[PDB]
Design a protein around this ligand. Structure first.
Ligand code: HEM
Ligand code: HEM
Ligand code: HEM
Ligand code: HEM
Lengths: 146, 139, 139, 146
């Protein structure tokens, strides 16, 4: 996960404009709607019986916030994602047993959310830098599997 | 299978894309090439630079294939048969690459349809593209 | 789609498995649980230790489902419909897990059919299991 | 890629019995037969028009030998797969542009070959140790993508 200075620039500039109280819940919600098996890990969240139910679900929004919190952290340590995500790895890997493919999926969902919110501004080069980022994070979160 | 709700959501999003479909197909391809450089090797004889006439031309082909799939959504294997043959046999496109282009197609719609790209429509489109991908890798 | 050659190769391998099918299904499950520990969480109420009556019992269910698919190879969506519903809706089995069990099913046949597991038969079986997996994840 | 002593034992014991002049070509051949898109990277090998053609193809057997050579190396350095496979990574990643998913596939194919050749001896615990190994290798070979 080496971003060029131009890739770094693209990521951080957009990321400063991100609404950290909303984008996370938007991405988790979409995950649970688009890839319904992921709802297996969130039975305690309540009504996930509809899209509207999922998106408007307070536990989804709440949890999505912490997820995006985690992403914001990695964006700060692209130099050392392994160390940054080590503990979250143990949790998702050793305790939750979430298949790592789902980390790649959530990353791609986040990318669709950023595109939705930013439109034209989410250019193909900007997307490419972000794909580097979400792949680096998914991989680090999956390290306790390797 | 695609539910009637899915079919309704997809036909809708297509409607809003309208005549920008070829243009969006081109943008989708560019997004794929930049984000997933391994995909570029299938296009050694293309200039893949931004504004490339060849990428624009191919984007229209792709968007037309997808529109044909939508228009014959209940009979996709038949509709996409010649393209299934093309991609699996001649081109031997790696199955993983269909997931990559699908993702870039979703990103592209998202960046162009603020109102239409709701979670439900996102879900329906993902399923549509996975169905197309399934057909295209069946041979 | 499955060619007639594939159908012939699969029906053959099934023939040689004969009455060991349930036993091989159990072994396949054990291989999956040990090799891919994430899969174990779908079976919290099973004892997954070697020799487990519950794993043996489930292995027979799995092998019977696969035999039913072989026996109605041209009509798998219909044949496997109730199981598609079960796996996608109630159990919400992650799609990746079907690739894991498929691999372990192939490993298990390989370890038991020296003569039958040729490259062509390997190819046909892989395609058969991917077709089953496709059906089981369609809902 | 930490193998327990029992996992290490299982791998090395079986591996000493492996026919290094044959198992590699068997695994590559099967790869090209089972996952035909991989034939894209081996157009220069000649007749791949049939299973028999592929398996009996001298360039397949020859190349498979070097592949298995690479695997034998990693089995020697499970402690440092990254460093071991670095150069092969650059090649497959930067020069060949092989999608890394194919590394996982070839690993699984190798596992089927070992099961075929060893039958009962390739027990479920032995397989589990080998899955750890082929995942570690695939991941290391893919590092020039991350
Ligand atoms: C893709 C990147 C992901 C990141 C950055 C991430 C991050 C997090 C964070 C920050 C927490 C809170 C931990 C705490 O409360 O101390 C968490 C918990 C949790 N995660 Fe994720 N997550 C990701 C993907 C996933 C996926 C894909 C799933 C399931 C499909 C999942 C399932 C869970 C569950 C069930 C919990 C709560 C479990 C508990 O608190 O015991 N995560 N994750
Ligand atoms: C939604 C998925 C896809 C659709 C609908 C699609 C559609 C098409 C169509 C309609 C053509 C015919 C172009 C012509 O006749 O001039 C074509 C050709 C081609 N496709 Fe795709 N495709 C898809 C996925 C892919 C992927 C994932 C790849 C590789 C990354 C790929 C690589 C190619 C190549 C290399 C050609 C030949 C282009 C040329 O030489 O002009 N396709 N595709
Ligand atoms: C070839 C692929 C598969 C086949 C043919 C198959 C077959 C079956 C069958 C026939 C049943 C019904 C058992 C009964 O009614 O008592 C069943 C149930 C079940 N399956 Fe599968 N399955 C497959 C893949 C998977 C995978 C990949 C998983 C998860 C890793 C899974 C998890 C389960 C679970 C948790 C049950 C309920 C078992 C119980 O509570 O007794 N299946 N499956
Ligand atoms: C899975 C683990 C793999 C290992 C350990 C491996 C190892 C090797 C080795 C040792 C060589 C010889 C390099 C040399 O001549 O100096 C090589 C070359 C090559 N590999 Fe692989 N390989 C793997 C997977 C793959 C896959 C899946 C593909 C394609 C689907 C592939 C495509 C190629 C090609 C086309 C060459 C020759 C290219 C050249 O010499 O310029 N490899 N690999």
């Amino acid at each position: 996960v080496h971003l060029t200075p131009e890739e770094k620039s693209a990521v951080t500039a957009l990321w400063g404009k991100v609404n950290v109280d909303e984008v996370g819940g938007e991405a988790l919600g979409r995950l649970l709607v688009v890839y319904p098996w992921t709802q297996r890990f969130f039975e305690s969240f309540g009504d996930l019986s509809t899209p509207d139910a999922v998106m408007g679900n307070p536990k989804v929004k709440a949890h999505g916030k912490k997820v995006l919190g985690a992403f914001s952290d990695g964006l700060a340590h692209l130099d050392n994602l392994k160390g940054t995500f080590a503990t979250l790895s143990e949790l998702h890997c050793d305790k939750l047993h979430v298949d790592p493919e789902n980390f790649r999926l959530l990353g791609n969902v986040l990318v669709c959310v950023l595109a939705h919110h930013f439109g034209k501004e989410f250019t193909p080069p900007v997307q490419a830098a972000y794909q580097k980022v979400v792949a680096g994070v998914a991989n680090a979160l999956a390290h306790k599997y390797h | 299978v695609l539910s009637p709700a899915d079919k309704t959501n997809v036909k809708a999003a297509w409607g809003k894309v309208g005549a920008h479909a070829g243009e969006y197909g081109a943008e989708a391809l560019e997004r794929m090439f930049l984000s997933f450089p391994t995909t570029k090797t299938y296009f050694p004889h293309f200039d893949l630079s931004h504004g490339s006439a060849q990428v624009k031309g191919h984007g229209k082909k792709v968007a037309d294939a997808l529109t044909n799939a939508v228009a014959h959504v209940d009979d996709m294997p038949n509709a996409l048969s010649a393209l299934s043959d093309l991609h699996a046999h001649k081109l031997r496109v790696d199955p993983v690459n269909f997931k990559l282009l699908s993702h870039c197609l979703l990103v592209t719609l998202a960046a162009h349809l603020p109102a239409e790209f709701t979670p439900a429509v996102h879900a329906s489109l993902d399923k549509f593209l996975a169905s197309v991908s399934t057909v295209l890798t069946s041979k």
